[PDB]
């Protein structure tokens, strides 16, 4: 009735991380998972899976459910946190209101994911990435739904969650303008691997002309090249860097194309720590080097801008995110 999108809410865990739930099986076994726009596998632990960092998870049972279809191709899926072992296996996945056969990873082992299995409360990750990017060569959730005339496009947004603010939605299958304020600008993808678009940057004298950028919804923080990095925090008083909140010298981060404009105020990548210090703040930026000028526009850029990932018009869309709906 009228919402003709399946949106999925979304919850903040300590502004590090954001979840949304998803089921798996013909009787709808619950999971808590990271949406991760940078990677293109999902999966879920298994009942098979006696590691301890299970224990404290909602398991999946093959066994229980009429619509599952036994694979057993040995896989591993390798994240920036670790690894995590299983084989494949193909079962009815609902997300939010729309449901699917899908191929996944059933993980029996995830000692090789620790400590942050076991100190975070996901069971597993959903991935939002491009096929060529996932293993098993598995088409996207997203495009499978799209294929299926399960949606109207075959595109997602992201409105995240603010710690202590508001909640968020994953929004599959079409954009909505309650998500939004300014213009919603487009960026096209320069490659079809990641969701990576070209941005010239500029933060205070230093400055990089047409840098790749990657929107990743699974990264805490936003990278910059070690080099700009330093330069940056020169002067600085910033002894991963830490401040005084009130700091009149942090600056503000410039992101430009042909066809719009983005800025990160440090209000958008300064973590309250105060509990540590007095008006002590975190600083949400990591020095990251890849083969070519790269930043990673992880949640704090995602947080300020609502995305749109589009994978019939191969580009990300921008646009500022509402404060509160």
């Not at 726009?37 to 006696?50: D, E, F, I, Y």
Request: hydrophobic residues 35%; proline residues 4%.
């Amino acid at each position: 009735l009228g919402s003709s999108n399946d949106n999925i809410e979304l919850v903040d865990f300590q502004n590090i991380m954001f979840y949304g739930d998803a089921e798996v099986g013909d009787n709808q076994q619950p999971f808590t998972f990271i949406l991760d726009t940078g990677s293109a596998n999902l999966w879920v632990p298994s009942v098979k899976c006696t590691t301890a960092g299970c224990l404290t998870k909602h398991l999946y049972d093959s066994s229980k459910s009429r619509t599952y279809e036994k694979d057993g191709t040995k896989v591993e899926m390798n994240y920036v946190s670790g690894t995590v072992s299983g084989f494949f296996s193909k079962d009815l996945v609902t997300v939010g209101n729309l449901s699917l056969p899908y191929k996944f990873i059933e993980v029996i082992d995830t000692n090789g994911f620790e400590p942050t299995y076991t100190a975070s409360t996901f069971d597993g990750i959903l991935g939002l990435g491009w096929k060529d990017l996932s293993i098993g060569s598995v088409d996207p959730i997203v495009v499978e739904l799209k294929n299926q005339n399960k949606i109207e496009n075959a595109l997602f947004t992201f409105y995240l969650p603010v710690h202590d603010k508001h909640t968020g939605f994953l929004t599959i299958g079409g954009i909505e303008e309650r998500f939004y304020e300014g213009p919603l600008t487009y960026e096209k993808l320069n490659h079809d691997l990641y969701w990576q678009i070209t941005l010239d940057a500029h933060v205070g004298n230093i400055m990089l002309e047409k840098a790749n950028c990657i929107v990743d919804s699974g990264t805490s923080a936003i990278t910059v090249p070690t080099d700009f990095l330093n330069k940056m925090l020169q002067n600085l008083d910033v002894i991963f860097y830490v401040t005084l909140c009130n700091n009149s010298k942090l600056p503000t981060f410039e992101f430009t194309s042909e066809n719009g404009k983005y800025t990160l105020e440090p209000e958008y990548y300064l973590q309250h720590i105060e509990d540590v210090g007095p008006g002590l703040c975190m600083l949400n930026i990591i020095g990251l080097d890849f083969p070519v000028p790269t930043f990673i526009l992880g949640d704090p850029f995602m947080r300020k801008y609502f995305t749109v990932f589009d994978y019939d018009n191969h580009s990300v869309g921008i646009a500022l995110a509402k404060k509160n709906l």
